[PDB]
Design a protein around this ligand. Structure first.
Ligand SMILES: Cc1cc2c(cc1C)N(C[C@H](O)[C@H](O)[C@H](O)COP(=O)(O)OP(=O)(O)OC[C@H]1O[C@@H](n3cnc4c(N)ncnc43)[C@H](O)[C@@H]1O)c1[nH]c(=O)[nH]c(=O)c1N2
Length: 250
C-alpha cells in the first residue's frame, strides 16, 4: 500500500492530455476523480486554484487550474515550461499520459476583484492567465457589462499568443481595454510594456487604475506596482495583487 496519513482536500486526476500550446507553455488536462474530472461539477468559479506536484512528489508548487462553466470535471493548467529546464523535462519524463496525479488545494485564486460596475484592469503576466481569462469572462457574463479592462503581457511574443482572444473581448463589447506589453525581451521580462512599470506609475498620476486593480503574474508587479502606488498616492480601495509564474507582470 502507498503512503497515506492526512489527506483532506485532495483530488485524483488521470493524465490524458498535456499538449504543447506554445514554445514554453503547455495545457495539461487531468480527470480521474470528483474535483476536476467528472464529479467536480463546474460552472465557472473565481479561478479555482489548488496545490499539486508534477507526479504527486512534494517539491513542486500550487497552480490555479480552470475548467469552464460545465458540470463535469476538467482541469486545464498553463504552466510555463522550458525545454531542458527543470519542470518541462520532468513533465514529459514523469508526467506522461500514462500515470495518475492528485491535485490538492481546496482554495481559490485572488487577484482580480470587480466592484460590479467600475473600470477595472487585470494585468496577467504570461500564459498562466488561463484562470485569469476564465474569471474575466465570468465578470462580463455575470453582471459586469460595464468597462472591463484587461492587461496582457509577456515576452517578445513570437513564443506567446492569445492577443486576438482578449482583443476579441475588447471588440466584443463592455468598455473593454486591452494593454499591449512586451517590447523586445524573449521570455525573461519582469513587467509588461518595455520599461520598469514606469507607464503604470503615470497612470495612477493620471486616471485609469486605482478603484479596482488586479495584478496577476510575477511578484514584481506586486513589488513595483505596490511601490508606485505608495510613492505617488493613487489611493485604491478594491486593489489586489497576486504572484504567479515567472516574469510577465508589472
Ligand atoms: C494561486 C496561484 C496561481 C498560479 C501559481 C501559483 C499560485 C499560488 N503558479 C505558480 C505555479 O507554482 C506554477 O506551476 C509554477 O510557477 C510553474 O513553474 P514550473 O514549475 O513549471 O517551472 P518551469 O521549470 O517550467 O520553468 C519555466 C522556465 O522557462 C523559461 N521561460 C519562461 N518563459 C519563457 C519564454 N517565453 N521563452 C523562453 N524561455 C522561457 C524560464 O527560464 C523559466 O524559469 C502559476 N504558474 C504558471 O505558470 N501559470 C499560472 O497560471 C499559475 N497560477
Amino acid at each position: 500500500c502507498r503512503i497515506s496519513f492526512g489527506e483532506v482536500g485532495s483530488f485524483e486526476a488521470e493524465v490524458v492530455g498535456l499538449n504543447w500550446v506554445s514554445s514554453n507553455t503547455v495545457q495539461f488536462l487531468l480527470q480521474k476523480r470528483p474535483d476536476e474530472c467528472g464529479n467536480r461539477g463546474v460552472k465557472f468559479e473565481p479561478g479555482q486554484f489548488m496545490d499539486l506536484t508534477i507526479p504527486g512528489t512534494d517539491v513542486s508548487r500550487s497552480y490555479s487550474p480552470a475548467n469552464l462553466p460545465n458540470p463535469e470535471g476538467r482541469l486545464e493548467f498553463l504552466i510555463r515550461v522550458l525545454p531542458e529546464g527543470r519542470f518541462s523535462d520532468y513533465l514529459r519524463n514523469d508526467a506522461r499520459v500514462g500515470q495518475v496525479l492528485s491535485v490538492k488545494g481546496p482554495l481559490g485564486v485572488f487577484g482580480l476583484k470587480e466592484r460590479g460596475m467600475a473600470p477595472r484592469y487585470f494585468v496577467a503576466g504570461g500564459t498562466g492567465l488561463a484562470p485569469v481569462v476564465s474569471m474575466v469572462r465570468q465578470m462580463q457574463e455575470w453582471t459586469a457589462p460595464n468597462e472591463t479592462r484587461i492587461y496582457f503581457g509577456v515576452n517578445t511574443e513570437p513564443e506567446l499568443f492569445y492577443i486576438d482572444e482578449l482583443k476579441s473581448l475588447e471588440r466584443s463589447m463592455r468598455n473593454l481595454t486591452v494593454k499591449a506589453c512586451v517590447w523586445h525581451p524573449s521570455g525573461d521580462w519582469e513587467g509588461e510594456q518595455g520599461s520598469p512599470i514606469d507607464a503604470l506609475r503615470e497612470d495612477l498620476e493620471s486616471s485609469d487604475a486605482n478603484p479596482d486593480i488586479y495584478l496577476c503574474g510575477p511578484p514584481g508587479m506586486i513589488d513595483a506596482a505596490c511601490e508606485l502606488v505608495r510613492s505617488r498616492g493613487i489611493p485604491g480601495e478594491q486593489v489586489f495583487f497576486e504572484k504567479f509564474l515567472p516574469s510577465g507582470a508589472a
